Amino acid sequence: CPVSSYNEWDPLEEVIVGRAENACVPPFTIEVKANTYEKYWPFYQKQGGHYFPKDHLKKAVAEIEEMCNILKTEGVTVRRPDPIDWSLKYKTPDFESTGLYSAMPRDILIVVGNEIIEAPMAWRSRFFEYRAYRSIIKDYFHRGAKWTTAPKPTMADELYNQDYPIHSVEDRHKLAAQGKFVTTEFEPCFDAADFIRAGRDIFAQRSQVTNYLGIEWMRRHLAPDYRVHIISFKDPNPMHIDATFNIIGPGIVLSNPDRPCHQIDLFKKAGWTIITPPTPIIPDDHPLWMSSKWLSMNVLMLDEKRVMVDANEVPIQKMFEKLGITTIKVNIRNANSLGGGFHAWTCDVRRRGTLQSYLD
């Protein structure tokens, strides 16, 4: 079976890497506004529905081709989504929208064992994102993998908190503490990236795009073999867990200094090593439209002792080096603008290893 991955560190053999092509600025709706930094609001207000800066996309394409070259050298089979125009306007009975991109496979696909799971998504601009990956998924299906598509939400207004403290309010930390974000509990919804795998245990975070209904759906779908746990952090704008609590080895995790975990004791007690990375060195003047600066810790492990880290982040490189971890430096400064690091731009289809417990 081509599909087989139980965690984030076993020897990588096959991966899907996203595309920067035809990426489009999402329409500036409630859920998009909730994610965007004040700094970029004008960009969104004017660019919404049109392609992200073509000059920038050309550089991102270049950067990702090089990253694929390197993965190939490291002995990894690379698959890529199909090219699609994300500017096509679609209309369901509940809403109308233009698309985003197929840059982040991690956002939409998660592999648990020999099964590929397509997350429902929570953003209107990402409703039909799965279309880019069907050619790859049908092939794995023909070859034996299990294929599951979690329930696709209606994404009706009812799913969003029309009156969320968007604009700037920060007490959104208070709602955050109450497990309350821009998505309601109207229907299940989640991005695959809010889940991070550690064998028989999977950790999930209730974020702006992943609700309790979505988490419960996964937990209930993977039981009894896998245990899905919920963990939270200090963060007024959570979306995906891989730039907050990135698990890089059996009992080793990278915890974002700015986003501490309320349940860190579960891990200290289990005898896990909690490493806090150094601060990103990316200039404040570089466009990070969909994200924070912490993409530096969004690393991808080729195996336990090999990490693909950003060429520009020397401090985090040094940290891995003192730990005895071989750093493979790839530069993706421009691809970073679309919202992800290596963990986000990929989806590990097959790693060599077995289903085990590490919290045990």
Name the binder of 97 from a second copy, ligand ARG, none, CB < 5-8 A by kind: none
List 60, 116, 145, 193, residue binding ligand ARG (CB under 6 A): 193
List C-alpha distances in Å: 234 to 24, 263, 297.
Answer: 30, 11, 17
CB-based burial label for 221 (10 Å; 0-12, 13-18, 19+):
middle
The only residue of 344, 347, 348, 358 in contact with ligand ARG, by rule CB under 6 A: 344
**What residues line the site for a second copy (CB under 8 A)?**
84, 88-94, 99, 118, 128, 131, 134, 138, 141, 146-152, 154, 187-188, 213, 217, 220-221
Contacts of 66 (CB under 8 A, 6+ apart): 330, 331
88 makes contact, choosing from a second copy, ligand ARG, none, with CB < 5 to 8 Å by partner type, with a second copy
Q: How far is residue 92 CA from its own chain's centroid?
A: 25
Q: After which residues is the chain broken (C to N over 2.5 A)?
A: none
Out of ligand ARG, a second copy, none, what residue 24 binds, judged by CB under 5 to 8 A for its kind, is: none
Q: Which CB sits closer to a second copy, 62 or 230?
A: 230
Q: How far is CA 84 from the centre of its chain?
A: 20
Rounded to whole angstroms, the Cα distance separating 108 from 105 reads: 6
Which of a second copy, ligand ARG, none does 292 bind, CB closer than 5 to 8 A by kind? Answer: ligand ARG
Residue 240 within binding range of ligand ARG, rule CB under 6 A: yes
Q: Which of 265, 264, 338, 344 is nearest to 297 (CA)?
A: 344
Cβ–Cβ < 8 Å for 145, 1: yes
Stretch touching ligand ARG by CB under 6 A, among 18-26, 102-110, 270-278, 351-359: 102-110
Buried/exposed 253-289: b ≥16 CB within 10 Å, e otherwise = bbbbeebbbeebeebeeeebeebebeebebeeeeebb
Site track for ligand ARG across 314-343, x = CB under 6 A: -------------------------xx---
Cβ closer to a second copy: 89 or 286?
89
- Taking a C-beta distance cutoff of 8 angstroms, is the pair 251, 359 a contact? no
Q: Which does 90 bind (CB under 5 to 8 A by kind): a second copy, ligand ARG, none?
A: a second copy
Does 106 contact ligand ARG by CB under 6 A? yes
Considering only residues 34, 104, 112, 202, which one is a binding residue for ligand ARG as defined by CB under 6 A? Answer: 104
